Design a protein around this ligand. Structure first.
Ligand SMILES: [Mg+2]
Ligand SMILES: [Mg+2]
Ligand SMILES: [Mg+2]
Ligand SMILES: [Mg+2]
Ligand SMILES: [Mg+2]
Ligand SMILES: [Mg+2]
Ligand SMILES: [Mg+2]
Ligand SMILES: [Mg+2]
Ligand SMILES: [Mg+2]
Ligand SMILES: [Mg+2]
Ligand SMILES: [Mg+2]
Lengths: 63, 151, 52, 102, 117
RNA sequence: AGUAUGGGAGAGGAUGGUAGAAUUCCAGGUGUAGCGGUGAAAUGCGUAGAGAUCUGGAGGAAUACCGAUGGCGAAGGCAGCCAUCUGGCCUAAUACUGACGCUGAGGUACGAAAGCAUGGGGAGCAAACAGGAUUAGAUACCCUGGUAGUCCAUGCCGUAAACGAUGUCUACUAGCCGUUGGGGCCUUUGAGGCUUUAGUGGCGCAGCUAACGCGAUAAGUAGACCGCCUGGGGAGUACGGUC
C-alpha cells in the first residue's frame, strides 16, 4: 500500500485508489482463508476443480 | 401486484374551499358513502377552529398537516429468521395519507360530544404540538432513529 | 539467474515483495524455479526485503 | 383445542365415542397446545354393509395457529386401527411441518 | 496538556466490532472509540454507520491537541474500513497516507475447525 | 536383459544447522470503558485497569507469495534456506557379456491416520469433560473453556472408499490439440517453426460394452504367470489354531 496523497488529492479519490491497490494486491483474500482449517483432501479437490475450469475456459477461448 | 402500474384516481376539489387536500380529508372521514355528512362534519370542525383564531382555514389545515407528517419509517424485512426493521424514506403520498389517518383516528378516540368538536380539538392540539398524532409521529421517529444503523 | 543480479530479481517482485507468477511474467518453468531460488537466497542475505 | 368429530350412517357414533376420542387425541397431541386450535375427525365405512381388509376410513384435519390447516387420511379394518394410523400420520406430518418452519 | 503536531490513526475492523485509536508517534495513545461504545449494540455493531460515528467521536476528542496531519493504519476485515477513514477527513483532519497492517501468517499455527451450521 | 565412460531435471531418502511472518504467555510506557461471541443471545474477560497501541523477553509448531492437468517415489507418500551421506530416473556415441528373461504357491520387506510401551516437549488445535444456548426433549449441531493426542527418541501395531473400485510383463492397431525433461534440423534478430523419445492431460475413427462408457496411459486384437467369484442374510461371525 503506502499510498501518498497528492496536494490536490481528494480523500474520497485517495480511498478509491487504496481500494484498487488492495484489490490488486489480494492481501484481504488471504485473511479469509486463515479463519478455518482446510483439510488436504478438500484442498486437492478444489485445486483440481479449478484446474479443470481453467482448461475449459481456455478451450472455449481458442475455440 | 406482480405486474402493471396502477394509476392514481382524481379527487375533485371541495365545494367551499376548492381544495383537493380537503376533499381527500373528507374521503378519509366518510363512512358508508355518507359524503354529505362527511362534509358537514369537516366544515363544522373548520368553522370551530377558525373561531378560535382568525386565519385562513385552508392554510391552518395545511400547516397542521405539515406539522403532523412523518419523516422516516421502517419496513420489516425477513432475512435469517429475524424481523430486521430497516429505516427507509417514504413517498409524499404515503406521508400525507398517514398524517390524515392519524389525525382522524386521534379525533375519533378523543372525548367530545361530536365528531366535529373532537376533530377541531385534534387540529388545535396538533397545531400546539401535543396530540395523539404528534405522539405517533414521535414514536415513528424514535423507532427509525433507534434502528438508523442499518441501511 | 544469480542472487546478486538484484535488478533482474526485482523485475519480478511486486511492491509487497511477493514473487510474481510465471503466468503473468511470461517466463519458462525452468527459469521460474531458479528465479525463486535466487530470490530466496537474496532475501536471506538481506539484499532484498522479505515483506512490504 | 376444540374437537369436532363426525361419523356416517354406517359407522355409528355415540357420546362415549366422543369422550374417548377427545381424551385420546388430546393426550397424544398435548405437547403443541397453543400451536393448534381445532381438530375435526371424520369416520366412514366406504362399501357400507360389506366387509374387507380395510373397509373403514378415518380422517383427521387440524388447524395450527398460524400456518394453514393440514389433513390426514387412513384406511383400516377397525375403528381403533383407523384412529391409531391417523394419529401416527398426524404426528409425523406436524413434526415435519414444525421442523420445516422452525 | 501535551501538544502534538502529528498523529496516527489505527482502525481495527472486525466482522463484529470496529475500534478507532488516535495516537501520537512512538505509540502513545491520545483517544479511542468503539462502535459498541457509541451505542449500536448487536448485529448493528458491525454496521459501517457505527464505524463512522466512532471515527467522528474519536477524532473530535483527539482534535484538542490540534494536530493537523496523521497517517491511517487499517487492520483486519469487516465493514467500516472506508467509512471510518471518510469520517476522519470529515472531522477536519488531513490524512497523510493510508496503509494496511493485516497480519498474514506464513503457514504458522493451525486455524480453528469448521462451523457445520 | 545387463555393464563402462559424458551430461541433465527433480517437495526421492537420512542427519545437522539456520532465516523471517504469525499465534500464545510474561514485564513496562500511553488510557479509560467496554471487549469477546452469536441468527439473537448467554457463558466468559475487564475500574484489583481490560480492549486497542508501542517497546522488551520465553517457548512451541508449521514454512505465505513462487505453485501449475507441475515434479519425484514400488506403494504408503514427499513443500522455507544451507551443508554432509545416499538410491533411482532421463538423455548421446562408442565399446563389452551373449538369453544371463517374465511371472511367481509359500516366504520375506515396506506400509496414511488412529491406538499402545518407555523417556522428553507442549505454542495453536482439539476426542473425553464442564458451563451457556436451541429444543417438547439435546445425552448433538452453535458459543465459552479444556485433558489425552497432535511434536521429539527408540520399539510395537499390519488396518483404510490403502481407488484410475481397472494385477504384472510383452507385441500390434485412424487421427487432432496441451504441458514437463532430454535429443536432432532450419530460420535468425536473440527469438521462433518442425521432428524423435520418456512422462502427465483433453477429444475422437474402428473395435469392445447391458448400459454408462473405454478408446496407443484400452475396458481393442493376441500370448506367459499369479490372485480371486459362484443368490441376499446369518457372516469377516462362532469354534480350533498363529501373531
Ligand atoms: Mg364410496
Ligand atoms: Mg353414502
Ligand atoms: Mg516377482
Ligand atoms: Mg504371497
Ligand atoms: Mg469444541
Ligand atoms: Mg529422526
Ligand atoms: Mg514393523
Ligand atoms: Mg482389506
Ligand atoms: Mg492413498
Ligand atoms: Mg480392493
Ligand atoms: Mg474376528
Amino acid at each position: 500500500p503506502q499510498v501518498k496523497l497528492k496536494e490536490g488529492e481528494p480523500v474520497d479519490v485517495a480511498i478509491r485508489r487504496f481500494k484498487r491497490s488492495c484489490e490488486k494486491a489480494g492481501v484481504l483474500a488471504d485473511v479469509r482463508k486463515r479463519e478455518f482449517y482446510e483439510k488436504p483432501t478438500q484442498e486437492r479437490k478444489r485445486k483440481k476443480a479449478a484446474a479443470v475450469k481453467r482448461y475449459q475456459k481456455k478451450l472455449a477461448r481458442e475455440s | 401486484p406482480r405486474r402493471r402500474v396502477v394509476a392514481a384516481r382524481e379527487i375533485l376539489p371541495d365545494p367551499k374551499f376548492s381544495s383537493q387536500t380537503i376533499a381527500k380529508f373528507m374521503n378519509h372521514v366518510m363512512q358508508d358513502g355518507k359524503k354529505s355528512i362527511a362534509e358537514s362534519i369537516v366544515y363544522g370542525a373548520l368553522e370551530r377552529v377558525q373561531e378560535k383564531n382568525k386565519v385562513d382555514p385552508v392554510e391552518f389545515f395545511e400547516t397542521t398537516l405539515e406539522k403532523v407528517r412523518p419523516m422516516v419509517e421502517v419496513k420489516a424485512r425477513r432475512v435469517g429468521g429475524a424481523t430486521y426493521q430497516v429505516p427507509m424514506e417514504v413517498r409524499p403520498s404515503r406521508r400525507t395519507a398517514l398524517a390524515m389517518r392519524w389525525l382522524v383516528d386521534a379525533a375519533a378516540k378523543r372525548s367530545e360530544k361530536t365528531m366535529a368538536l373532537r376533530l377541531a380539538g385534534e387540529l388545535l392540539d396538533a397545531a400546539e404540538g401535543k396530540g395523539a398524532a404528534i405522539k405517533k409521529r414521535e414514536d415513528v421517529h424514535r423507532m427509525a432513529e433507534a434502528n438508523k444503523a442499518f441501511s | 539467474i544469480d542472487y546478486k543480479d538484484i535488478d533482474t530479481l526485482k523485475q519480478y517482485i511486486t511492491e509487497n515483495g511477493k514473487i510474481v507468477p510465471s503466468r503473468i511474467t511470461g517466463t519458462k518453468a525452468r527459469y521460474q524455479r531458479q528465479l525463486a531460488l535466487a530470490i530466496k537466497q537474496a532475501r536471506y542475505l538481506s539484499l532484498i526485503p522479505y515483506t512490504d | 383445542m376444540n374437537i369436532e368429530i363426525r361419523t356416517d350412517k354406517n359407522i355409528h357414533n355415540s357420546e362415549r365415542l366422543i369422550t374417548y376420542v377427545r381424551a385420546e387425541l388430546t393426550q397424544e397431541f398435548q405437547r403443541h397446545s397453543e400451536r393448534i386450535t381445532h381438530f375435526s375427525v371424520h369416520f366412514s365405512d366406504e362399501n357400507g354393509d360389506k366387509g374387507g381388509d380395510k373397509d373403514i376410513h378415518c380422517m383427521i384435519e387440524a388447524r395450527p395457529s398460524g400456518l394453514k390447516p393440514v389433513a390426514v387420511h387412513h384406511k383400516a379394518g377397525n375403528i381403533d386401527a383407523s384412529i391409531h394410523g391417523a394419529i401416527e400420520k398426524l404426528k409425523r406430518s406436524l413434526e415435519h411441518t414444525f421442523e420445516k418452519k422452525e | 496538556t501535551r501538544t502534538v503536531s502529528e498523529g496516527v490513526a489505527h482502525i481495527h475492523a472486525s466482522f463484529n466490532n470496529t475500534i478507532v485509536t488516535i495516537t501520537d508517534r512512538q505509540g502513545n495513545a491520545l483517544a479511542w472509540a468503539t462502535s459498541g461504545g457509541q451505542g449500536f449494540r448487536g448485529s448493528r455493531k458491525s454496521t459501517p454507520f457505527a464505524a463512522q460515528v466512532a471515527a467522528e467521536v474519536a477524532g473530535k476528542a483527539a482534535l484538542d491537541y490540534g494536530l493537523k496531519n496523521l497517517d491511517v493504519l487499517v487492520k483486519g476485515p469487516g465493514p467500516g474500513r472506508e467509512s471510518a477513514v471518510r469520517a476522519l477527513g470529515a472531522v477536519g483532519y488531513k490524512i497523510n497516507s493510508i496503509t494496511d497492517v493485516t497480519p498474514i501468517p506464513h503457514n504458522g499455527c493451525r486455524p480453528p475447525k469448521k462451523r457445520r451450521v
